[PDB]
Amino acid sequence: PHTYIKTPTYREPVSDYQVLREKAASQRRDVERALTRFMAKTGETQSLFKDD
Amino acid sequence: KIVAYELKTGGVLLHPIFNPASHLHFSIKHPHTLSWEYYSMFQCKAHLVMRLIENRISMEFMLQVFNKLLSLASTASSQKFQSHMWSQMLVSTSGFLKSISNVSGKDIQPLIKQWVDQSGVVKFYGSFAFNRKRNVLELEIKQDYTSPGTQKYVGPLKVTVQELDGSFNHTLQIEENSLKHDIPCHSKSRRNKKKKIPLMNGEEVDMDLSAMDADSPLLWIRIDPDMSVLRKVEFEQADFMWQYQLRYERDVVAQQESILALEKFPTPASRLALTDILEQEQCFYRVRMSACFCLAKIANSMVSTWTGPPAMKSLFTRMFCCKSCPNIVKTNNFMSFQSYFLQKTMPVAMALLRDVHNLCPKEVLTFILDLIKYNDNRKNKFSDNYYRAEMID
């Protein structure tokens, strides 16, 4: 029945609470790190260390 | 607060007579020469002495005193005579004591003479011994009255003894030459049969009596339980008595003082007592918040004996994390207001853990950083600023 019949398939769904918590956490941390580095680079900046 | 301030520098003198207080570097004749810490401790001591006057003369008579003062003032407040009657709106000490004596028939002049006119707090050092032969409890209460902030107490003193037959109150007369006070003790027939031991309130509980002495019935002793004097108590119980007082007492100040006294006994039974307090809802939440820091101190003192994980970590994952993921914290729902306070105070105490090398372990620091990363607050009706601020702490 490659010759007379057929049926569709789908992509593998990731319904796991652990990896969904990890994905949302890491994406939130990365976007807030990118935002704060962009705003500290395009403005007046301070530094805990000398010339940092 | 007041016993710390009065033992630190001199004492607060309510109602001075015009210097009356020369132990301190400012003059107490005017409010604008007082130190600000003295002003704060003045208001604090004034409301505690009013609680003492309520203890001697009951609360309904106290509210009748206040209503009589307000009623004289409000009959005064409507006249037009220029102060023939407008000075009934001004209270004095003699007028207040006279109104108290009018409504109650008792005068409080010894209590006023001790706690108002005299400027000192008392220090109690207690130690007991149980006489098995005559079945008595020999208390030994001595006062430190030679410190700069202290004074000598000669009144009566309440003591509450929890024995196997229940909770009994005793009044002791502590004169100047007194040292040994023999009070009688009851049976120990609730160790013959397993019966429940009745508490300070009407209830009764099952206690594990394996830690108790075989010859003594008494489970714990509390000197001045109702805080009826301005005092600092230093009682010498045994560590199992402090653990029984932490577990089964129905008074929050006794649970707090047993937490404070269990830091000197780092035995694993005290760790079990504080961990059972921490796991226990229907305990007052500010006792569990103190048991966190007490458990951290005890855990720091019994390194090279601690068996499993660091303290409170497994308990945090049992109470506040997911069942399927132990290292992922649950999403924030702060609607309980007691597990919110306990959740935001438990890593702050957990970070005071130290290893054998005096460095914080990388299992607790990693746990705190995972608490910070996996924090999701898009679902509760409350803000997250104090919990995140405590995470930084």
From Swiss-Prot, chain A:
Induction, per UniProt: Induced with triglyceride accumulation.
Compartments where found: Nucleus; Cytoplasm
Free-text comment about domains: Ectopic expression of the histone fold domain acts as a dominant-negative mutant resulting in differentiation inhibition.
Disease link: Neurodevelopmental disorder with severe motor impairment, absent language, cerebral hypomyelination, and brain atrophy: An autosomal recessive disorder with onset soon after birth or in early infancy. Affected individuals do not show developmental progress, are unable to sit or walk, do not acquire speech, have poor visual fixation, and show poor overall growth associated with feeding problems. Additional variable features include seizures, spasticity, and joint contractures. Brain imaging shows hypomyelination, thin corpus callosum, and cerebral and cerebellar atrophy.
Family as reported in the entry's similarity comment: Belongs to the TAF8 family.
Miscellaneous remark of the record: 'Taube nuss' means 'empty nut' in German.
Quaternary assembly: Component of the TFIID basal transcription factor complex, composed of TATA-box-binding protein TBP, and a number of TBP-associated factors (TAFs), including TAF1, TAF2, TAF3, TAF4, TAF5, TAF6, TAF7, TAF8, TAF9, TAF10, TAF11, TAF12 and TAF13. Interacts with TBP, TAF1, TAF6, TAF10, TAF11 and TAF13. Component also of a small TAF complex (SMAT) containing TAF8, TAF10 and SUPT7L. Forms a heterodimer with TAF10. Interaction with TAF10 is mediated mainly via its histone fold domain while interaction with SUPT7L is via its C-terminal region.
Protein role: The TFIID basal transcription factor complex plays a major role in the initiation of RNA polymerase II (Pol II)-dependent transcription. TFIID recognizes and binds promoters with or without a TATA box via its subunit TBP, a TATA-box-binding protein, and promotes assembly of the pre-initiation complex (PIC). The TFIID complex consists of TBP and TBP-associated factors (TAFs), including TAF1, TAF2, TAF3, TAF4, TAF5, TAF6, TAF7, TAF8, TAF9, TAF10, TAF11, TAF12 and TAF13. The TFIID complex structure can be divided into 3 modules TFIID-A, TFIID-B, and TFIID-C.
The protein, known as: Transcription initiation factor TFIID subunit 8
Species for this entry: Homo sapiens
Higher taxonomy: Eukaryota, Metazoa, Chordata, Craniata, Vertebrata
Recorded name of the encoding gene: TAF8
UniProtKB/Swiss-Prot annotation, chain B:
Superkingdom, natural source: Eukaryota
Coiled-coil ranges from the UniProt annotation: none
Tissue expression: Expressed in all tissues tested.
Signal peptide segment: none
Disease per UniProt entry: Neurodevelopmental disorder with feeding difficulties, thin corpus callosum, and foot deformity: An autosomal recessive disorder characterized by impaired intellectual development, microcephaly, delayed psychomotor development, pyramidal signs, thin corpus callosum, and foot deformity.
Similarity remark: Belongs to the TAF2 family.
Name of the protein this chain belongs to: Transcription initiation factor TFIID subunit 2
Organism from which the protein derives: Homo sapiens
Full-protein interval shown: 401 to 800 of 1199
